[PDB]
Subunit: 306 residues, 3 copies
């Protein structure tokens, strides 16, 4: 079927729904915006889940190949990540169904990493050229997503465990990723995944603020600072990133963008850097809006599905 | 003599004695268990120290070779680490003798790293293939051990310095270690040392809780989360680790296991994740119990000493 | 002109002026010492700025080459760093002019890194052999300097953003730097830059204490611990560092030394490790004093300028 990376679309939309949700008491109309984005993300997730179920049943060898690949395996983590985010959305309407989805996605991502990420340490399969930003998905983003989802359900201390796993995994991987990028020019076909480099600090602070009841403290400010540094670097790099043209892979940026938006709501609520917060929230919405527009355009030309 | 790595045996036993010690007021019988493990660890340490003194006097070129090796040097750090842990045990009976051992081990480990770990930065001796988990011993575990031992003696601020040295050294080394493991299959003869990968987060949180008066805070929960992630990964990898058979090298795991047990006592005392704490404490005791049983078995067959 | 690295001289002197400044209320005579060092640093900075302006106008291709070099570009960051430090000095006399310099240096360093540090991620220019301690200048030291300068002006939350950018950039680069040093013997002509390895933890804690109102907390103690570990390692390595002779490049050490001095004033004020603080402050002053003496000597022999 469907390329596994397309789960980035409901991921980005779902995460953006949750960001707007957190503005509802400052600005009541934010709830309708959140509900609309959340319904659209959920519908797209349902479709993509059904399509992936079909892939498993009738194209299993494609799934097997992607699973055993030391690079492509990572995109599978998008499935449980999006499952948890849809759970977080649904919590506003039905906490029971939300909790089921959150546990399925949590157990699923932990099983996934435990099976596949650890296996890499056997050596001889992963190569230096396998050192791609997509590795953040199973290693980092999945753990932060479990952290914030478990906090939503009231399991704050368990959430902190998943939080720590993601934060330390991030700091442990990024050094070798950035060195690899410096030495080796990432080929155009993979370059859109540079957008995932935006994610770690913003997804980290978003998850942190979810678990710590929105307390904007020293750690949060530290994370925002490195997050904005990476944003500036990626903005400068953008023309290089899209050297060979705009493409649907640019949804890679939506994880970081939506988390910039979510964290910005908490900085704003805490009266920390409110002007920066407004900029971050507007910027991220405009960019995801542009992703949506370019996606509708592609669907319009029959250039969406493979 | 005696392979230097055999100091891992009294290390694991001593650390486990200290874990049980910290349960004595919740469960008084824990003290007898702690005292027994502590006496056995101390007796084994005495024997191994005397044997290593004999190695220094009559097999000095073997010591010299191990010292100058960019891989084997690390195991020497087990000597001052175990010396400090025996000091921590003895403190319950004789604080004066305890303090002497703790300072000997602290000054010894710091001198050792200052001489040998820094020397590696001259280049040309350490190679990519030298990137082994054993490096954590002089670089990380030795500093955490000094931190907690100095805290025991009431030198908390000095303990925090050693703590920071170990924590930042850990985060600075692990990125390149895990990348190396991914690319290069660690040969079977070294694979038991994968057990040292369990140690950092647990030894870190154990030392931290020792210095901060057992306050189970955000940092502690973060460390436990990454610690359990690594545990799960190593459990999945275990059949690969022991591909060529069970061996005495598996005492490599005891450092992390004993620190899981120790930290679990503090999480339990703090009423944080008590169910996880009970599991961690029981699991680690069972695994170290299995190490002891397999060791008695080897001694029984005359397959212990070289 | 003038080698760009010579900006390390007013950098080291300016930073040391700020350290003495922070003793003025414990020891009033410290103010005169601070004022003298600050005037000398400012005068040297003025001279070097004018000389670099001349280089830009009449030797532009030399500047272009250094800018595009994946190793030599880093020294350019010394210009905005020193500009901010001179601003911090001048603040005691004229806060308006100080603020102008601080914003010029902040915007300048951020623009510099955004343009050049990010560009490295395109690959194919930076090589493994490009992995030099000088990279800390644009990546780490510049951000910490902005953090503390902005805090001086009362912009603490913005300062925390720059702080986080520098701290996380540090932890992200150092792993690959130390692995490179282990494997590859850094050639003598670059070895004096090993002194920059002293800087990160001390510049970090100095900036942190500037933003957090001098509160010597757990993070501060942790940073000092790793800072002293690196000091000990570099002391052991010093004879290797200067294998081919003493040279003006040794001003590389002044960044870390001056930050040891500055942070020591805050530990002393906070009654934390006062004995260590006194040692650190005296040691760093003696070493920078020796740099000054060797520099006067070189100027005396006409061996200073190229
Ligand atoms: C999201 C789900 C991804 C799962 C991919 C599973 C990869 C399976 O792996 C395969 O399992 C087979 C049995 O069915 C074995 O024959 C093979 O040895 C093994 O390659
Ligand atoms: C998102 C949900 C993911 C869980 C899917 C589990 C599929 C793994 O399946 C297992 O993986 C092993 C290697 O890692 C292989 O031995 C086999 O394919 C199988 O044992
Ligand atoms: C590589 C990752 C960087 C980690 C930075 C951790 C910073 C922790 O910082 C701590 O936060 C508390 C709340 O504001 C403060 O009260 C403490 O005094 C402060 O040190
Ligand atoms: C998380 C970032 C998005 C938050 C949106 C805030 C936009 C509101 O804008 C603000 O409204 C204030 C009062 O409500 C006015 O006082 C401010 O001047 C104005 O900037
Ligand atoms: C635990 C103790 C380990 C110490 C190992 C010391 C390594 C000594 O090193 C050697 O010292 C000799 C002198 O005795 C010199 O001749 C040699 O140059 C040097 O290799
Ligand atoms: C656990 C106690 C350890 C301290 C032992 C110190 C032995 C080091 O000895 C020194 O090491 C140098 C290289 O690193 C060599 O020059 C020589 O062997 C010697 O100078
Ligand atoms: C790479 C290493 C990860 C470091 C994580 C540091 C987390 C510090 O976290 C801090 O702990 C305090 C105590 O609970 C809190 O009050 C602070 O608000 C919290 O930020
Ligand atoms: C550090 C982990 C080991 C701690 C051992 C705890 C085992 C005790 O077990 C517990 O006893 C409680 C009261 O004492 C009972 O109320 C609990 O239900 C029970 O789980
Ligand atoms: C501190 C200031 C450093 C700036 C160095 C600038 C490097 C300029 O770069 C050059 O700019 C030229 C135009 O002037 C172009 O022709 C070139 O493509 C480009 O190499
Ligand atoms: C300390 C103040 C530094 C700011 C100087 C900016 C000089 C950069 O100039 C730019 O750099 C690009 C590559 O990175 C090149 O395209 C060109 O030289 C130019 O566009
Ligand atoms: C790789 C970088 C290491 C980061 C270490 C972060 C330590 C944060 O530590 C926090 O500091 C506060 C102030 O003292 C305390 O109250 C917290 O309880 C303590 O955890
Ligand atoms: C930051 C490190 C430099 C601080 C300099 C301190 C030197 C003063 O020295 C100290 O003076 C005290 C009272 O003023 C005496 O009581 C102490 O015994 C003495 O050590």
């Amino acid at each position: 079927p469907l390329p596994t990376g397309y789960f980035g679309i409901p991921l980005g939309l779902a995460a953006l729904s949750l960001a707007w949700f957190h503005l509802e008491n400052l600005f009541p109309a934010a709830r309708m915006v959140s509900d609309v984005l959340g319904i659209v993300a959920s519908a797209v997730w349902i479709l993509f889940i059904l399509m992936y179920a079909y892939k498993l049943r009738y194209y299993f060898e494609e799934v097997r190949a992607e699973y055993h690949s030391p690079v492509r395996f990572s995109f599978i983590a998008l499935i449980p990540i999006t499952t948890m985010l849809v759970g977080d959305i649904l919590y506003r309407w039905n906490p029971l169904i939300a909790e089921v989805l959150i546990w399925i996605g949590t157990i699923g991502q932990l099983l996934f990493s435990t099976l596949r990420v650890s296996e890499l340490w056997q050596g001889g399969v992963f190569e230096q050229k396998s050192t791609h930003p997509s590795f953040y998905l199973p290693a980092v983003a999945a753990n932060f997503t479990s952290a914030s989802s478990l906090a939503l359900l009231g399991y704050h201390d368990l959430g902190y465990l998943f939080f720590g796993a993601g934060m330390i995994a991030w700091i442990i991987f990024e050094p070798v990723l950035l060195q690899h990028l410096r030495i080796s020019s990432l080929e155009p076909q993979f370059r859109a995944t540079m957008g995932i480099v935006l994610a770690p600090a913003f997804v980290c602070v978003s998850a942190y603020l979810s678990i710590n009841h929105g307390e904007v403290d020293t750690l949060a400010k530290i994370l925002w600072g490195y997050g904005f540094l990476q944003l500036f670097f990626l903005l400068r790099l953008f023309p290089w990133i899209v050297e060979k043209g705009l493409n649907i892979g640019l949804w890679a940026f939506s994880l970081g963008l939506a988390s910039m938006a979510n964290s910005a709501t908490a900085f704003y609520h805490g009266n920390v850097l409110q002007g920066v917060s407004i900029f971050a929230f507007v910027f991220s919405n405009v960019m995801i809006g542009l992703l949506v527009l370019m996606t509708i355009y592609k669907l319009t030309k029959g250039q969406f599905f493979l």
